[PDB]
Amino acid sequence: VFRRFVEVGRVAYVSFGPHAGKLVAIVDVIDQNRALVDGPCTRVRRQAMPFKCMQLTDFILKFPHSARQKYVRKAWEKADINTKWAATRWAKKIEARERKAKMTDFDRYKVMKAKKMRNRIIKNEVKKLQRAALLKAS
Amino acid sequence: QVLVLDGRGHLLGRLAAIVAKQVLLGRKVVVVRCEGINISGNFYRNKLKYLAFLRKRMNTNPSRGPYHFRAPSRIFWRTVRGMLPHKTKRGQAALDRLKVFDGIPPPYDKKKRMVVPAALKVVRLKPTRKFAYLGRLAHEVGWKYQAVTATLEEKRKEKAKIHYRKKKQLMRLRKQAEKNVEKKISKFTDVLKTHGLLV
Amino acid sequence: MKTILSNQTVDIPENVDISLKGRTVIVKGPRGTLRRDFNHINVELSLLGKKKKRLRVDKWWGNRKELATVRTICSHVQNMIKGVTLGFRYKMRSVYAHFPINVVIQENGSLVEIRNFLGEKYIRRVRMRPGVACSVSQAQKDELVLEGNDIELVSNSAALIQQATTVKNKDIRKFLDGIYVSEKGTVQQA
Amino acid sequence: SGRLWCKAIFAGYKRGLRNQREHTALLKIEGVYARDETEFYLGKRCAYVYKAKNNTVTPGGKPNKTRVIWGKVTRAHGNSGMVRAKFRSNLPAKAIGHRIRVMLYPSRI
Amino acid sequence: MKASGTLREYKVVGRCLPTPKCRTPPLYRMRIFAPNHVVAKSRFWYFVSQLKKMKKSSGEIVYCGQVFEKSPLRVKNFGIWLRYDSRSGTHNMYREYRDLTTAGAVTQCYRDMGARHRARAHSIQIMKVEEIAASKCRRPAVKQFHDSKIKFPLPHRVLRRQHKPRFTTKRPNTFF
RNA sequence: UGCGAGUGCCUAGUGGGCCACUUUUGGUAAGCAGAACUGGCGCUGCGGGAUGAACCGAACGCCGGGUUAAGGCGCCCGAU
RNA sequence: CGGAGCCUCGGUUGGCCUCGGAUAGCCGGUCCCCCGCCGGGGUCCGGUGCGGAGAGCCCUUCGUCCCGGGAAACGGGGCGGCCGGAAAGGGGGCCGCCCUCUCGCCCGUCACGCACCGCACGUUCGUGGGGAACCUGGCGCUAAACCAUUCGUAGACGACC
Ligand SMILES: [Mg+2]
Ligand SMILES: [Mg+2]
Ligand SMILES: [Mg+2]
Ligand SMILES: [Mg+2]
Ligand SMILES: [Mg+2]
Ligand SMILES: [Mg+2]
Ligand SMILES: [Mg+2]
Numbered sequence A: 001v002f003r004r005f006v007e008v009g010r011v012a013y014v015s016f017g018p019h020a021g022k023l024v025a026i027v028d029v030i031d032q033n034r035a036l037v038d039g040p041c042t043r044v045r046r047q048a049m050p051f052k053c054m055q056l057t058d059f060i061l062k063f064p065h066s067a068r069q070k071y072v073r074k075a076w077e078k079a080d081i082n083t084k085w086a087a088t089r090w091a092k093k094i095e096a097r098e099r100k101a102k103m104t105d106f107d108r109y110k111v112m113k114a115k116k117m118r119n120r121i122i123k124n125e126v127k128k129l130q131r132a133a134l135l136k137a138s
Numbered sequence B: 001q002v003l004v005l006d007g008r009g010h011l012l013g014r015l016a017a018i019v020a021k022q023v024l025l026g027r028k029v030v031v032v033r034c035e036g037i038n039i040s041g042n043f044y045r046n047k048l049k050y051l052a053f054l055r056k057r058m059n060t061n062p063s064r065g066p067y068h069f070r071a072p073s074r075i076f077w078r079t080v081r082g083m084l085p086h087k088t089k090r091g092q093a094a095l096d097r098l099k100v101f102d103g104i105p106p107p108y109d110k111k112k113r114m115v116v117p118a119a120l121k122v123v124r125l126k127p128t129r130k131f132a133y134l135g136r137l138a139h140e141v142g143w144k145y146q147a148v149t150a151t152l153e154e155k156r157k158e159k160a161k162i163h164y165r166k167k168k169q170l171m172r173l174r175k176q177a178e179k180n181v182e183k184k185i186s187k188f189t190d191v192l193k194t195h196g197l198l199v
Numbered sequence C: 001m002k003t004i005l006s007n008q009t010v011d012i013p014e015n016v017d018i019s020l021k022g023r024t025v026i027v028k029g030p031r032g033t034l035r036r037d038f039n040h041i042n043v044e045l046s047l048l049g050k051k052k053k054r055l056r057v058d059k060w061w062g063n064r065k066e067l068a069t070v071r072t073i074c075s076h077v078q079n080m081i082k083g084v085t086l087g088f089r090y091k092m093r094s095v096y097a098h099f100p101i102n103v104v105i106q107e108n109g110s111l112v113e114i115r116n117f118l119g120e121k122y123i124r125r126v127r128m129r130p131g132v133a134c135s136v137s138q139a140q141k142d143e144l145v146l147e148g149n150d151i152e153l154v155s156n157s158a159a160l161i162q163q164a165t166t167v168k169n170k171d172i173r174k175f176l177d178g179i180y181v182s183e184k185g186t187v188q189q190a
Numbered sequence D: 001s002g003r004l005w006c007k008a009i010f011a012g013y014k015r016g017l018r019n020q021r022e023h024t025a026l027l028k029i030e031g032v033y034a035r036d037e038t039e040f041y042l043g044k045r046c047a048y049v050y051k052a053k054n055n056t057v058t059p060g061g062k063p064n065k066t067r068v069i070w071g072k073v074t075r076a077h078g079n080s081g082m083v084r085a086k087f088r089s090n091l092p093a094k095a096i097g098h099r100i101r102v103m104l105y106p107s108r109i
Numbered sequence E: 001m002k003a004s005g006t007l008r009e010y011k012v013v014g015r016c017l018p019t020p021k022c023r024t025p026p027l028y029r030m031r032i033f034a035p036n037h038v039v040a041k042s043r044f045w046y047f048v049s050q051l052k053k054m055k056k057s058s059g060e061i062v063y064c065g066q067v068f069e070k071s072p073l074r075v076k077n078f079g080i081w082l083r084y085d086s087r088s089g090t091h092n093m094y095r096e097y098r099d100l101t102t103a104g105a106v107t108q109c110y111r112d113m114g115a116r117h118r119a120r121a122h123s124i125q126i127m128k129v130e131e132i133a134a135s136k137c138r139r140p141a142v143k144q145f146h147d148s149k150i151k152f153p154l155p156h157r158v159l160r161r162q163h164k165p166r167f168t169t170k171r172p173n174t175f176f
Numbered sequence F: 001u002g003c004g005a006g007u008g009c010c011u012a013g014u015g016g017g018c019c020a021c022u023u024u025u026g027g028u029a030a031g032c033a034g035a036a037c038u039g040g041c042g043c044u045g046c047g048g049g050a051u052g053a054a055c056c057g058a059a060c061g062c063c064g065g066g067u068u069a070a071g072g073c074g075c076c077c078g079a080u
Numbered sequence G: 001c002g003g004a005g006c007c008u009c010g011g012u013u014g015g016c017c018u019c020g021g022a023u024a025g026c027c028g029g030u031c032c033c034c035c036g037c038c039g040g041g042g043u044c045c046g047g048u049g050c051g052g053a054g055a056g057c058c059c060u061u062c063g064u065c066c067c068g069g070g071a072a073a074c075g076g077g078g079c080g081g082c083c084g085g086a087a088a089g090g091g092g093g094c095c096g097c098c099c100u101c102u103c104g105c106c107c108g109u110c111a112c113g114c115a116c117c118g119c120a121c122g123u124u125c126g127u128g129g130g131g132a133a134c135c136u137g138g139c140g141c142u143a144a145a146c147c148a149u150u151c152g153u154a155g156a157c158g159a160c161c
């Protein structure tokens, strides 16, 4: 069963292309595989985008199918998409990947030295839990 | 260093195309469970094709002519052989470093089998198109071991299910463990999060 | 051209209920229960209305040949519901000219013995598909009655016996013998 | 204490369909699969290391069985991260599909 | 003509050379869709030679300029009247398209005609293109998009970028 | 617009040809027989047409680097 | 089964120890509930451009020397028993052992090392495969095949009974 639909007003993340990594808002549907789109609050001019470069998100902000950038914008700020997107776990793991790619030599050394002890502690206490299971089985 | 591929859900020639170049480049490829390889086009078409290949035969002395291997693994192996330059010693070395099996033998039933999405049926075929199964085709053109392989495969499946449930119990224990000892490991979770290893 | 949406609904009577497990439809009613898998047809099945009133099948972005398959599912579900709430009864007549066709039913209504067809001597066995019962009618001279829950199995078995009693290498325009499906109806005639 | 070179595969010679140019080798560096991604390795020098029957001198050590052919990455080759290399002696044909070390030290970072 | 890339709209004006018979001949303008101005002028001479009694040598191009669309940010329906040479005979045809620009609609028409009739840009002879109001459109493939509350999902998302993780260990997901 | 021209002796081999776009005669037609114009093969290797006298590109001293023609870029096989 | 070396063939330069599958759907818990030998189903709760993510996980090695903090104590390391395997059979888990270390891991203090004077095949898997010998020991073993001969269920000669 489908939950995300292409109608007027749905916002969508752009995965690849020139405006990759930015949100947009669907303004109109041109044909089977192309939509007139505009992200006013996120540095994306009104244009046409194929649907296959866009991947839908579960946010809908309401405006008429031919409204101007003024009204698309007012909808965007009154629905404060820029904060909800950052609050979503999708953007959290996006920025997690970006930070991981951003790491350097010294800080990856720090990560290695940290997760070494973290894994040691976890492994020891897991062994403790296993022997607890054995003793209560006995 | 050994690349173990699973054969279920793949397309025969489109997978052999990847495997041939990979083997020519020096990798040791082990394709496993070839009775699940699919082929585009309906079953009657595919079996007519294989029966024409079967009719191909040397009139004077058939024992010298083309060899019509019936096992699915051997069909896949001969496809890769056709894609490789088998008449040269480099191609022969490639053939030697390729290995193919039906079912999943004990050398490899305890290993993580990869998958090649470029040659995968769900990716490369429209849902409305018909296809066929190499195991069924081989059985109907002469393979004599479809049932035995099926029983051995189901046995392997219960053993793997036991192992999987053990793994799940272990990792649930581990997550219980970390949410037990978060207070003592909190000084490292933050330094992982700040570089994007967690969440 | 690709059509954006093609949908159709089927209403569900109250005494019977429907459950959806993906694209497998399970229908349970007074006469029993039966299941059909539709994983070969690639549509969207929704079960809407509280107290489970409507089943809606729809397809998005389909051309002619598989937007034609939308109503096939509705017809199958209607036949399924009709079978589980009323059952199917195939009344078949045995017609002959000189030699009386002898029909004997055994294995509790699951096997049919046909004797003396066209004065032959080879005895013809037919085995009835599971869940279908064949009975010899009463208050009729030469009639078989077929009782079942699934129209597919009932009609398939009726065709089995009908084409088992067939005349060979003669003018079938004049040798009009055999057992033919006279009428198709329900068990509880509501 | 560990490895200090990238792994590459000597895929073949620079060639048309029916003509081989033995003075230019083709390397496939593992990990890189794009023209825009293979720029880092341009100009890096590479080594083909093999072992022979009798001992040969070893700079900064005692004679041993190992020998090397030295070469250098020249430029990219196609859209899939293949690179071209020139060795000071044309590579033997028995090295097809064998490991070539691509060093880091001719570095421009 | 070769329909290379996205086409462009060119206003091309031209006239016969001033002769002792008539001091100034009438001017003739034309809308031409072509990859660039050289082929635009070539097509102008082709068409004006077909219609009037004019030739490249006996006439001259007076102004050849690109024509920009007056609303490149609102979707429009375009009706196209054209004429093409099949394997057996030539036919008039009327077609509907739906996009932002007239040049885009024309190049979409060229691609469509090539795909559906195996016609080629030299055989295709465009004659008329007009922006059509949404209630005058005739083809269902464009009329079914005339729904204010249009709504459809993306059912079967085929995996792309299937060679970047060439040897993965996950079966790809197609439902989103 | 381009280019150095004129002129005299002695002279070998040749005097079986064949093919292609357009023109074209006989013939049902022919990998048939016979003509016109131009270009080829014979006398000519090289990239492509899997393979080939004449097809498409391009004509050749021995080499290094770069770039293209025609034709191509799943694997054989360089390149999506 | 229990040592130094020699010759020759090479490749290689951290491991991933496993659900089954679906793709117009999946994954993970929970069990309040229902069946079966812990498993299946129902409800509910959570994730889904997958983070219980192969865009992933594990290991990460300069060494030693003092003292402190954190973590460990039930741990580390080294002998007897229980199970774990057949498609081409598991160097794994568990129970005891006589012993030993407060050493291993993370932050700190403390100095030390061929600091070989800018320069290449460095760093492994590896007691690698194979072939000869020098060997000190223990436990054990003293077979066949072919020719010749005979046979004719066989036979051109070989072969075969
Ligand atoms: Mg007769
Ligand atoms: Mg001729
Ligand atoms: Mg000659
Ligand atoms: Mg010449
Ligand atoms: Mg030539
Ligand atoms: Mg050809
Ligand atoms: Mg050159």
Ligand SMILES: [Mg+2]
Pocket: none
């Ligand atoms: Mg080719």
Ligand SMILES: [Mg+2]
Pocket: none
């Ligand atoms: Mg070495």
